[PDB]
Amino acid sequence: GFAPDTDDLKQLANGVDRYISKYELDKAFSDRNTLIIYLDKVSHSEDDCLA
């Protein structure tokens, strides 16, 4: 019964180091069971937090 928001994913795709597929965008609240995120780099010095 849960699904991630669309505008947040749009903002993430707008920003660097974050990529969400276009096919995920036109995948509205009816079906968003699983999500996929790709990170360009992972920071080892500190913790990279995304919400």
């Binding site: 009816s30 079906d31 069971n33 699983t34």
Partner: protein, 247 residues
């Protein structure tokens, strides 16, 4: 719902390992053979190969015959090779649809395993209904806790509303005891009579293994390996014949 409907269980990686004899009278050197075989429950492509051993012509392998097996709506349950006891694990139940123009609203369930700890219980069972637009793929994540070591069973069944189309998949996975599989060499010995023995006959004692930090409720495996060491020696090829060309 999922009680009078059978599932798919036979998923071998190689079958039809059979032999056949061509005994029909020849028709310009070609014999026709009509044989009934049953394709496996797996939904994939089968590379059927044939090798003929004739007593007059010779051996011959046929160009690989590819058989494509298809369904307009099915389920694939993807599992790792092995799991570890008393841990949280997540598995993928993909639903594939290849009907070009039809919206699907399907009910999916998995039967409980007494050797597994999921939300599935003898009374409280999974009851979820999902929606698939035509020509797309889905994915259901499932949470499980392995309890006892062994080859266990995973059941999944799916039924589409307003159509007489159903599917089921049974898969087998290994459950491994927690910890690192290690191999503590108990003993290595050289066996040699009349050198370390007492007048031919010998007797050597192997103490029990330490096993101080063994995980309880597990069974171990003691392998005794025997081997013969070649003592190949001298007396190789003698003098060459070149020196004998004068006698």
């Amino acid at each position: 719902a999922e009680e009078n409907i059978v599932s798919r269980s036979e998923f071998p990686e190689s079958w039809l390992w059979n032999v056949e004899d061509l005994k029909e009278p020849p028709k310009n050197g070609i014999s026709t053979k009509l044989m009934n075989i049953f394709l496996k429950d797996s939904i994939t492509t089968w590379e059927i190969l044939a090798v003929s051993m004739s007593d007059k012509k010779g051996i011959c392998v046929a160009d690989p015959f590819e058989v494509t097996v298809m369904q307009d709506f099915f389920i694939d349950l993807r599992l790792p090779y092995s799991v570890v006891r008393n841990e949280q694990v997540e598995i993928r139940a993909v639903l594939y649809n290849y009907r070009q123009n039809q919206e699907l609203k399907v009910r999916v369930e998995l039967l409980h395993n007494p050797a597994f700890c999921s939300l599935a219980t003898t009374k409280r069972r999974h009851q979820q209904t999902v929606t698939i637009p035509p020509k797309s793929s889905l994915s259901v994540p499932y949470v499980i806790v392995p309890l006892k070591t062994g080859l266990q069973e995973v059941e999944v069944k799916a039924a589409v509303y307003h159509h007489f189309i159903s599917d089921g998949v049974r898969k087998s996975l290994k459950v491994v005891p927690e910890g690192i599989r290690m191999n503590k060499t108990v003993a290595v010995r050289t066996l040699d009579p009349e050198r370390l023995g007492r007048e031919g006959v010998q007797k050597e004692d192997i103490p029990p293994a330490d096993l101080s930090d063994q995980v309880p409720d597990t069974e171990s495996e003691t392998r005794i390996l025997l081997q013969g060491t070649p003592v190949a020696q001298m007396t190789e090829d003698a003098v060459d014949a070149e020196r004998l060309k004068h006698l």
